[PDB]
Amino acid sequence: TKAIRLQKKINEARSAKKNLQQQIKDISTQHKTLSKQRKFEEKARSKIHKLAPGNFYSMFQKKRAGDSVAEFYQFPEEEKAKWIAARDAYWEKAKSYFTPKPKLGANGFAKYVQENYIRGDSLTETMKKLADEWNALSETEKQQYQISKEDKEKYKKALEKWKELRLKEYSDYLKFKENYKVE
Amino acid sequence: TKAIRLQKKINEARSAKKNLQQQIKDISTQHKTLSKQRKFEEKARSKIHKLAPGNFYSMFQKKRAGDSVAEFYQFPEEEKAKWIAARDAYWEKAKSYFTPKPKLGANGFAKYVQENYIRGDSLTETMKKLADEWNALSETEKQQYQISKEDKEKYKKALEKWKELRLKEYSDYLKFKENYKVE
Amino acid sequence: DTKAIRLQKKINEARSAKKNLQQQIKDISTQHKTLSKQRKFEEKARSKIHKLAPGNFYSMFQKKRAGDSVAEFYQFPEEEKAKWIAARDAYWEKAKSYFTPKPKLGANGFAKYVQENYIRGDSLTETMKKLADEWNALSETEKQQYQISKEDKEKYKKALEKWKELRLKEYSDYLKFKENYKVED
Amino acid sequence: DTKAIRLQKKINEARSAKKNLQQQIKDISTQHKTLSKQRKFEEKARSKIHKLAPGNFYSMFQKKRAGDSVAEFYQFPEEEKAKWIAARDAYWEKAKSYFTPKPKLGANGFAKYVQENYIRGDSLTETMKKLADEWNALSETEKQQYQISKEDKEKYKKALEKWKELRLKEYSDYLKFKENYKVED
DNA sequence: TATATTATATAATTTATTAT
DNA sequence: ATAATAAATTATATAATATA
DNA sequence: TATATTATATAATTTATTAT
DNA sequence: ATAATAAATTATATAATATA
DNA sequence: TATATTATATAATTTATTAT
DNA sequence: ATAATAAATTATATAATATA
DNA sequence: TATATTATATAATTTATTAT
DNA sequence: ATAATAAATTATATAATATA
Q: Which sections of the sequence are annotated for DNA binding (chains A, B) (predicted)?
């Protein structure tokens, strides 16, 4: 019974080590899923940039993309212009899917420049002169040029809803890009 | 909440690994205890051998045992004989603590030699002649020279009780040997 | 004999070879941390120089937490605030003297078209759009004229190399300045 | 450059050195199993030769389980049993011919006293006890006469060495005999 | 550094050996 | 089997290396 | 997928037992 | 040493688990 | 061999750059 | 800010090595 | 007991925002 | 580019856990 108890403890240890191995594999699988999710959310909110024409052409050739752009460099002017116009129509359709990111309000000296910039001024000269005016302000004079807590929370709410909808917009864009014929 | 769940799984994994480390240390400690127990039970049932005189002398000198036996080799005859007589009295007292192991009954050809050996015979000649007689027996003639199942189970019961009491006897002997003054 | 003799020799070689492996693992770990420190320093020595905020200036001279330090700087009077701002500005002049601004690469393609063909315009967005229309109406060899030659590219390569070098020494001198700078203002 | 160059060289040395360590671990494992097989064979080549049981003899010639084989051998008739016993005995004579019995070391101390001073006795236990009384009544130099000289010890050392050698060849020949032995009886 | 190896230093026990 | 001894073998203890 | 464990299934060896 | 065995112990092989 | 590294091969995206 | 491009940087995919 | 992690606390840098 | 900031992001340091 001494060795019986000891073997019983050995068997519980081997079972416990098996449960640990399963939990490690479960956290690894879930971690890979969350890493893919984070990558997707990063691309779905990124800055939308007009696709270059070579990348368009490699999108439409099932050969490898690099060689396709290389062959696109040697193209004549006429086929190159046809590809560029088709790429531009695709660009209009593509940018349609996305909503531009909510901008935050001008604050402090930025708001001062927003209010006291007058049309037809040297930007460097106006910025420096406005800076000299701004620096001479007392701290409560500056404190009235800040964004209220109400507008800050409104921008928080708008950025939050946009962080949501850019996910769905990006998915719709990806479906558009996979199923887009030149036509 | 994705990362919340994932971290929760990571924390359960670190707790589970801690429980596993504790269980491994528990089985290691218990394993060492059982190994000491088995060693003790092995010595408590071993064959009792009369202690050599040098080992006696090293028992009684708190210097290291090997050097003590080495100094005991160079001893004169008189002190050597005093140590040997004291060791012999210790041997009588020591062998008193132990019960000799139950012998199993003679079986088969051994029992045949037990029954047909007659006093004053060449042992090699009697053993060989009895072997020639034995081999010529039929299988049921041999089968009556075996130990009955009843006596086999009786020897099992006796060896079992002895395996028990040799533990207690050995412990009493160890207490005797630690607390024994020559006197 | 020789079976056990060979076996013992290999067992000794493994224990020595295992110590050698353990040493290389910590040495490559050491060099990896060192080369990373080397990277983050050469990165800081080349970044864009930004005028230190006054709260950060005030926290530089107090051996306390930076958050607590800037919080104490916000509640300053207007005069004390102006004195710290003037001291921070004298510091910033002395600091920006140490650095060389990064060499820019030449304008290429449409950027060079704007650089060569920009005429003063009251509306910049219409001006850039008009230059875009002129550029797009150009042929491919007309556009190809507006690219940077290999000579200008290699000159910028050597300029960026010498600058990446010298910014390390500039940053080292700046750090010596920042450690040994008494407020004095 | 050279920071990363040195670091990459050490990282490559560790991965090669790690393969070298993995190889030595399995090689020392291989040699350890091999040297253990070497030990168990030289051990079997020198053990005391015991006449093979008839059930084990019968199981040698059947490609079945040994327990089942001896069970089939127990239920044999007396005549068939005698035939197998005679065949096993012819086998045992042919087998024990292959081996040399182990050289014994000379009797020493009280054993040599018994070897030199044993006179025929009807009661052996009283005889050994009487020799014990004669021995114990001897002085220490009288006892010291009855020990084995260094010359006889070294002769036994060389004899045991040559025997430990030759028993390997004897056991090898016996195994060739046992593999190539047809029952024939 | 606790806590397995390992190893190496020392003591305890068994074995061999005589005869039978 | 009785019986006695060194030698060999095994076991045990303590120190060193190595691995959690 | 080799390759330590490990475990356990089967066989091989050794032991004990008579007498002494 | 003589000799024949059941039984106990050890060794080897085969199958399963597991950890490189 | 599943299943982390890693690495190396290829594609996607951002940056710099002109003027302001 | 507008706008256009190669180049650089980053990210992604696939293949190889290594570690459970 | 160094020494990877790791985690999290604090500080440093960069970004965005106005105009353009 | 000019310039001043809150805020966001990244980097560095300090403290805790953990695995050599």
A: 102-163
